[PDB]
Amino acid sequence: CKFLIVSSTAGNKREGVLKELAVATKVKKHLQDDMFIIPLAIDENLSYDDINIEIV
Amino acid sequence: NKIFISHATPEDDDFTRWLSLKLIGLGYEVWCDILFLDFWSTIEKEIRENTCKFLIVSSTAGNKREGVLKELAVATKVKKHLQDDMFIIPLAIDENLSYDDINIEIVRLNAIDFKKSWAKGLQDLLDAFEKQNVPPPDHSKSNLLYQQIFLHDKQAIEKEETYDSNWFPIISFPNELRFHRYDWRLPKQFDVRTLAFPAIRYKEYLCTFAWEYDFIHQLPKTETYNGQESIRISTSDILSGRYDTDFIRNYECQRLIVQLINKAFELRMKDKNVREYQMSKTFAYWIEKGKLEKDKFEKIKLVGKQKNKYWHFGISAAGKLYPSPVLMVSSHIIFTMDGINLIKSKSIQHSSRRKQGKNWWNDKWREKLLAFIRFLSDDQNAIYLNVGSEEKILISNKPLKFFGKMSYVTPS
Amino acid sequence: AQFHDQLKARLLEHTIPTQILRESTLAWRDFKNTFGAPIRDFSKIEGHLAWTISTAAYYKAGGKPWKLGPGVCYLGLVYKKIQNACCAAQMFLDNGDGTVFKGEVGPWYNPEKGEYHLKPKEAKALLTQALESYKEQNKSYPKEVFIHARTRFNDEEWNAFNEVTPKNTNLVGVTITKSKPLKLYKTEGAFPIMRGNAYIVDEKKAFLWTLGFVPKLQSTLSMEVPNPIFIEINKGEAEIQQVLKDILALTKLNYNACIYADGEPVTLRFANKIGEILTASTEIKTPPLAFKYYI
Amino acid sequence: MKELIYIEEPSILFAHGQKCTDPRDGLALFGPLNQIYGIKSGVVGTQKGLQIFKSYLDKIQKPIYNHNNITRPMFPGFEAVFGCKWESQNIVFKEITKRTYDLVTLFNDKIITANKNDEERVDVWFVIVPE
DNA sequence: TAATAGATTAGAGCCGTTTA
RNA sequence: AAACGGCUCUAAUCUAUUAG
Numbered sequence: 001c002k003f004l005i006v007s008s009t010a011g012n013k014r015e016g017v018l019k020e021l022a023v024a025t026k027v028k029k030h031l032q033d034d035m036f037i038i039p040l041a042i043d044e045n046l047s048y049d050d051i052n053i054e055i056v
Numbered sequence: 057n058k059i060f061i062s063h064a065t066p067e068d069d070d071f072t073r074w075l076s077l078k079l080i081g082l083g084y085e086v087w088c089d090i091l092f093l094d095f096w097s098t099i100e101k102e103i104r105e106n107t108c109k110f111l112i113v114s115s116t117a118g119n120k121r122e123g124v125l126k127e128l129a130v131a132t133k134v135k136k137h138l139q140d141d142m143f144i145i146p147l148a149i150d151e152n153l154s155y156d157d158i159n160i161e162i163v164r165l166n167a168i169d170f171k172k173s174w175a176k177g178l179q180d181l182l183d184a185f186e187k188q189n190v191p192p193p194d195h196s197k198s199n200l201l202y203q204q205i206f207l208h209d210k211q212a213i214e215k216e217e218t219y220d221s222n223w224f225p226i227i228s229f230p231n232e233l234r235f236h237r238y239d240w241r242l243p244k245q246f247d248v249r250t251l252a253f254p255a256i257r258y259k260e261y262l263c264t265f266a267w268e269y270d271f272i273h274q275l276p277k278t279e280t281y282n283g284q285e286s287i288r289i290s291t292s293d294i295l296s297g298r299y300d301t302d303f304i305r306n307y308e309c310q311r312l313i314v315q316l317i318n319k320a321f322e323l324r325m326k327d328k329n330v331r332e333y334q335m336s337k338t339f340a341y342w343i344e345k346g347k348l349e350k351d352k353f354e355k356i357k358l359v360g361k362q363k364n365k366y367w368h369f370g371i372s373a374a375g376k377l378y379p380s381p382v383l384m385v386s387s388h389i390i391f392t393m394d395g396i397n398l399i400k401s402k403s404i405q406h407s408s409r410r411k412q413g414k415n416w417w418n419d420k421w422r423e424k425l426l427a428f429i430r431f432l433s434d435d436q437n438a439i440y441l442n443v444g445s446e447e448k449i450l451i452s453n454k455p456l457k458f459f460g461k462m463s464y465v466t467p468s
Numbered sequence: 469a470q471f472h473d474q475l476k477a478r479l480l481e482h483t484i485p486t487q488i489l490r491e492s493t494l495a496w497r498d499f500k501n502t503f504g505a506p507i508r509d510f511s512k513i514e515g516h517l518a519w520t521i522s523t524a525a526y527y528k529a530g531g532k533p534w535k536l537g538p539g540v541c542y543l544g545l546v547y548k549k550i551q552n553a554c555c556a557a558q559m560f561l562d563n564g565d566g567t568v569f570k571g572e573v574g575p576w577y578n579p580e581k582g583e584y585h586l587k588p589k590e591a592k593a594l595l596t597q598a599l600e601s602y603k604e605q606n607k608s609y610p611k612e613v614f615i616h617a618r619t620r621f622n623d624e625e626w627n628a629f630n631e632v633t634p635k636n637t638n639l640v641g642v643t644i645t646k647s648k649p650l651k652l653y654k655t656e657g658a659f660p661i662m663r664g665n666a667y668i669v670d671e672k673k674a675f676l677w678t679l680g681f682v683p684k685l686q687s688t689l690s691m692e693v694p695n696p697i698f699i700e701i702n703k704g705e706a707e708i709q710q711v712l713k714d715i716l717a718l719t720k721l722n723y724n725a726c727i728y729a730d731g732e733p734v735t736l737r738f739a740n741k742i743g744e745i746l747t748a749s750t751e752i753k754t755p756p757l758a759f760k761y762y763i
Numbered sequence: 764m765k766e767l768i769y770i771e772e773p774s775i776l777f778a779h780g781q782k783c784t785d786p787r788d789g790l791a792l793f794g795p796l797n798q799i800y801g802i803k804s805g806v807v808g809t810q811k812g813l814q815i816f817k818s819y820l821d822k823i824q825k826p827i828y829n830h831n832n833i834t835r836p837m838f839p840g841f842e843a844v845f846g847c848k849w850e851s852q853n854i855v856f857k858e859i860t861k862r863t864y865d866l867v868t869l870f871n872d873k874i875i876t877a878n879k880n881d882e883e884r885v886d887v888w889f890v891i892v893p894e
Numbered sequence: 895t896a897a898t899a900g901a902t903t904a905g906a907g908c909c910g911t912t913t914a
Numbered sequence: 915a916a917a918c919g920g921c922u923c924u925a926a927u928c929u930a931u932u933a934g
């Protein structure tokens with residue numbers, strides 16, 4: 001139903017989370033609902049800039 | 057020092073390709089996804105690392121797609137990072153999309169008008185980031201980039217290909233061509249073209265490959281005629297040109313042979329259960345409707361229907377001997393109202409032919425010609441021409457075949 | 469019928485580059501058939517239409533759209549029925565690497581009804597005019613004179629040609645015949661034979677596919693199955709492969725159209741067009757000789 | 764199995780010494796060899812013909828699309844390709860309002876009087892023939 | 895002069911826009 | 915006549931021969 005992606009410094013660029021996020025956006029497009037993917041930003045060092053395009 | 061161009065790829069592909077190729081021509085490092093043959097991480101690295109300008113194309117489809125929107129989003133994040141107001145340059149190109157209905161993220165930016173005269177928009181872009189200090193012109197780079205990706209998908213390749221032609225070789229000729237000394241047995245006012253076998257009036261002689269006693273049923277005076285009077289000429293020397301005497305020259309003898317071939321094939325279609333229609337210089341031979349199984353020979357259609365009319369594939373044959381003994385069949389479409397009765401008007405026939413040949417291409421033309429020729433054939437790999445009672449002309453069922461070392465990948 | 473040719477002829481004396489456009493061409497949508505779609509459906513080719521018109525307008529205004537890529541003067545000569553009139557079109561490369569493609573004019577008249585050949589005097593005049601044009605443009609006589617036509621050359625007119633050409637200059641006579649019945653298909657693909665293929669029959673005669681499917685355009689320059697053009701070197705000594713290369717090169721300079729290439733060498737086509745222009749109206753002394761006044 | 768030889772595609776030169784096979788793609792990519800500054804368009808024809816030519820010359824400025832943009836390239840726009848100005852607001856108009864001879868004579872003498880008497884220069888005369 | 899071919903040639907129209 | 919093609923139509927000529 002929903003896809004919460006952890007958006008720490010390490011968790012926004014690792015390969016496995018990236019592929020899971022990619023397939024998540026694909027199933028989001030299939031489901032035609034914008035209320036699917038939720039980024040949970042937890043990291044002080046990581047600002048709202050420098051974040052991944054797929055979640056920016 | 058890169059100029060990133062973001063756009064809707066299928067809608068704005070042409071504009072983006074043109075603009076990127078020009079900009080590379082003037083000597084600007086340009087990054088576009090259609091200029092490159094995961095990927096999104098590379099896009100992020102280029103947008104955040106070493107791009108100077110970020111151009112966004114602003115058609116009516118360039119503001120409602122997620123991908124262009126999010127590359128614009130990372131672009132604006134980098135824009136706020138560099139503290140440089142000159143980062144995101146819109147390029148509005150669509151007349152239907154006004155300066156309203158445009159995305160919030162790009163509504164406040166000073167766009168460049170490509171709505172009219174793309175040249176003026178490109179000039180605005182150039183004199184914009186010329187004094188904006190965006191970093192020699194080498195158009196050879198643009199030509200190379202055009203060749204590597206926009207061109208390489210389709211080109212001439214070292215691929216062997218094989219071809220069927222219009223030329224059907226003459227497998228074998230009657231060995232001897234016979235001139236008959238028909239002074240009084242042959243009337244002078246009689247037409248020799250209606251004779252049961254092909255006949256030419258040459259030097260008062262009767263040029264034919266047929267025997268001296270074929271022309272009996274409708275030319276009865278020709279009986280009891282001495283065969284020594286006839287001159288028999290080796291056809292091999294005619295074809296090779298060895299026979300060149302004062303009596304008859306080689307080229308005119310070959311002309312008689314070609315006339316014989318054309319006339320004999322005419323009478324062959326006369327007996328081949330195939331109808332004829334009159335062209336300007338030759339006769340077109342086509343099958344009537346209902347004379348083939350499911351309107352097909354083998355699996356190739358030769359007679360069909362379109363817009364209340366019927367089309368019949370037709371062939372017009374004419375031999376030649378210059379490259380080799382071989383005729384060249386010509387492919388035509390002959391139209392009718394009910395499939396059995398011809399349309400008298402030629403302009404309607406021409407218009408219908410141009411309509412039908414519009415959707416026909418190499419495969420259809422070749423399959424129809426091959427099907428027709430294999431349909432008229434009596435022998436499995438040859439067709440018979442009744443030029444003599446014991447002599448016949450053999451035409452190969454398979455036309456002359458060719459092959460080339462260079463070809464193309466077939467798009468389908 | 470003869471509006472275009474007469475109009476272009478009457479402006480030859482006072483040289484005025486003109487382009488005739490029909491209202492059914494510039495605005496084709498406005499003119500229907502009273503029943504439906506317009507007479508001239510240009511929807512699929514609107515961009516191409518704009519391309520061609522723009523190219524024509526740029527050429528007639530003194531602009532050079534595209535060049536070609538020496539020492540050979542290509543003389544495409546064509547006869548027009550009227551007495552018959554022979555009109556030429558020459559193309560060659562100068563020391564400035566700028567292809568000179570103007571067309572030899574002052575049509576040479578053969579009074580014979582069906583003899584599509586030049587009398588010795590007219591042949592000498594034509595070849596002298598072409599050689600002098602090449603000399604004045606290039607400061608030297610051509611190394612080769614590539615005379616081509618849609619007809620074959622008799623021995624007396626070619627003898628006049630050879631008598632009137634100067635030394636260390638070789639002239640080659642080429643006949644390019646269209647619609648010779650060799651419909652050569654492709655048994656594997658569903659698309660026609662790729663353009664550029666040549667069936668060399670002998671050392672002097674061959675077939676060339678100057679038109680057909682092109683990989684670069686991903687389709688054909690011609691509908692149906694392409695009709696090869698028969699190239700016969702009936703006069704002169706020249707390699708058949710080199711002649712085919714030259715013909716393919718000449719198929720590129722159609723400045724009257726913005727198309728990839730045309731089925732025939734463009735020297736013959738432009739000579740034909742200026743022949744129509746000349747024979748449309750009365751005689752003109754020293755006609756303009758530049759294509760922008762004819763095409 | 765007769766050998767079919769291949770002759771390499773000849774390349775036509777363009778601006779800046781860039782050779783391309785297709786005249787259209789080479790023109791759009793690099794441009795014409797010489798730079799004429801503009802076309803002083805002159806038009807002889809009816810007022811409806813003038814309107815049609817002006818509308819089409821307006822349409823020429825904006826890029827126009829074929830139905831199949833890969834089999835036949837687009838037109839980027841006249842100034843985009845040729846680098847010279849050919850607007851429709853700078854047109855020298857000559858209004859008009861055996862039959863072949865006099866019909867040709869109308870447009871003809873219009874053009875000759877305009878080229879002779881009129882001060883405004885015309886680089887090429889666009890005869891908008893009615894239908 | 896007329897005819898019958900085959901070979902070269904030339905003129906006109908006429909339709910479609912090059913299979914994705 | 916934006917154009918290039920595919921066709922369709924017509925005519926002429928050169929040969930060789932036969933009948934005027």
Ligand SMILES: [Mg+2]
Pocket residue numbers: 524724763916
């Ligand atoms: Mg034109």
